[PDB]
Design a protein around this ligand. Structure first.
Ligand SMILES: [Cu+2]
Length: 257
């Protein structure tokens, strides 16, 4: 199996999933001084108006909000993308200390957490088929930094008690993901992979420059989930992040100067 522990952590993943040592693995450190600004990139289009959330679940790796992706309700397009990408899931990578938690780093700096809004290319029929394509997924990464409480996240915060342990799930309809975005849509983009097994290199990464803020109380609560199942020794779901991987010969582009 796999996890974030000493014996099944990121350093062990390559034995079950050889692609862990591939050419386009994620996350990566974003060196703001070498990223290439590209004014040819069309603007990032986020259309979450009729988004329809379904459930929130603790799969032992993170909390996950699942959406109905049977139609073009909550979609992502524009930016470096060709076609339409449907939102299917949102989860969070969180640290144990405010100075760590994010998967992507900026000039080596790590944020307290990182939200990943996963979308898949509609020209592929469904998510399962999409992950098998180099351009099958588009994942929006949003950093979290301590500040004023974030209303959009309080919705999640308010339900955490119900999904404390691995396998627990709860109804999570009428959740508006628009509430998870910072003011600016400026971003960095590069070709990468899923950051948890199977680690398929099928995603176009779009990492927002502006982190959203969350209150200390909110962050504390997001660290109260468990990796373990109910009844087993309690293992706090903290530091469920994969460290930065070798960029190799990939170019990180910026949508802003
Ligand atoms: Cu993720």
């Amino acid at each position: 199996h796999w996890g974030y522990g000493k014996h099944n952590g990121p350093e062990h993943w390559h034995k079950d999933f050889p692609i862990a040592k591939g050419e386009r693995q994620s996350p990566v450190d974003i060196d703001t001084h070498t990223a290439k600004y590209d004014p040819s990139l069309k603007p990032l289009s986020v259309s979450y108006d009729q988004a329809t959330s379904l459930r929130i679940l603790n799969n032992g790796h993170a909390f996950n909000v699942e959406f109905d992706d049977s139609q073009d309700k909550a979609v992502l397009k524009g930016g470096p993308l060709d076609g339409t990408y449907r939102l299917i899931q949102i989860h969070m990578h969180v640290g144990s200390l405010d100075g760590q938690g994010s998967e992507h780093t900026v000039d080596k700096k790590k944020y307290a957490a990182e939200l990943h809004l996963v979308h898949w290319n509609t020209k592929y029929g469904d998510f399962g088929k999409a992950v098998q394509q180099p351009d099958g997924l588009a994942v929006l990464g949003i950093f979290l930094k301590v500040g004023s409480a974030k209303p959009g996240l309080q919705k999640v915060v308010d339900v955490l008690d119900s999904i404390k342990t691995k396998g627990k799930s709860a109804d999570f309809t009428n959740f508006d993901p628009r509430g998870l975005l910072p003011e600016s849509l400026d971003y960095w983009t590069y070709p990468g992979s899923l950051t948890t097994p199977p680690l398929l290199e099928c995603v176009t990464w779009i990492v927002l420059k502006e982190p959203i803020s969350v209150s200390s109380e909110q962050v504390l609560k997001f660290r109260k989930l468990n990796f373990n199942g109910e009844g087993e020794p309690e293992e706090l779901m903290v530091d469920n992040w994969r460290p930065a991987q070798p960029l190799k010969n990939r170019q990180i582009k910026a949508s802003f100067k």
